[PDB]
Ligand binder design. Structure first.
Ligand SMILES: *[C@@H](CC(=O)OCC)[C@H](C[C@@H]1CCNC1=O)NC(=O)[C@@H](CC(=O)[C@@H](NC(=O)c1cc(C)on1)C(C)C)Cc1ccc(F)cc1
Ligand code: NA
Length: 179
């Protein structure tokens, strides 16, 4: 838990884009990650502070299939505490995960979602998506960007759900390499 708490305080920010409220994980330096559908564009608000987005990269797999993740570089002089060490090299499930949500509307929220298991292909609102995992928990609107954590590991970012189940984009440490 001390891990989840530390991650919340130091790395997980309340964010708004023109698409609404999202949770945002800052990973290292000025690099953070949002769900693709948040469409960060040119600027975002972080805790109500307007920040330029210097680059927004929509991640896709070897075949160009959507991974539903957007890496953003933020025009700021502050650096995120480097949490790459806590991100697995290979997309991994987990047995007792906690979904960390942090928005203006759902501030500092820890959601026990239980087991996180490999799912794979997801037709998310008509958009082919790969490398997803699933949890049998009723996730809701406003929880996208939420950080899926397990015993000291950051394993996923919440991207969708169908009412009974939630789905995250799995994380690989390689996503966050310096070029
Ligand atoms: C988070 C973002 C948000 O709140 O958007 C509000 C306008 C949100 C969380 C979930 C909504 C329901 N419970 C959730 O965990 N994510 C979304 O709304 C995306 C789309 C979906 O989640 C859809 N789910 C499915 O398509 C689906 C399919 C299967 C087998 O299981 N679930 C529903 C809303 C129908 C946002 C999104 C992502 C990617 C896109 F290309 C378009 C839209
Ligand atoms: Na924006």
């Amino acid at each position: 838990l001390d891990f989840a708490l530390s991650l919340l305080r130091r790395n997980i920010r309340q964010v708004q884009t023109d698409q609404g409220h999202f949770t945002m994980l800052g990973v290292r330096d000025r690099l953070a990650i949002l769900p693709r559908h948040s469409q960060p564009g040119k600027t975002i608000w972080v805790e109500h502070k307007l920040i330029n987005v210097l680059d927004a990269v929509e991640l896709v797999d070897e075949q160009g299939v959507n991974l539903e993740l957007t890496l953003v570089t933020l025009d700021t002089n502050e650096k995120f505490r480097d949490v790459t060490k806590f991100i697995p090299e290979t997309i991994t499930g987990a047995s007792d995960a906690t979904l960390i949500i942090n928005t203006e509307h759902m501030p500092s929220m820890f959601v026990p979602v239980g087991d996180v298991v490999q799912y794979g292909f997801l037709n998310l609102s008509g958009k082919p998506t790969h490398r997803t995992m699933m949890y049998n928990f009723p996730t809701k609107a406003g929880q996208c960007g939420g950080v899926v954590t397990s015993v000291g590991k950051i394993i996923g970012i919440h991207i969708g759900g169908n009412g009974r189940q939630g789905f995250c984009a799995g994380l690989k440490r390689g996503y966050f390499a310096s070029e």
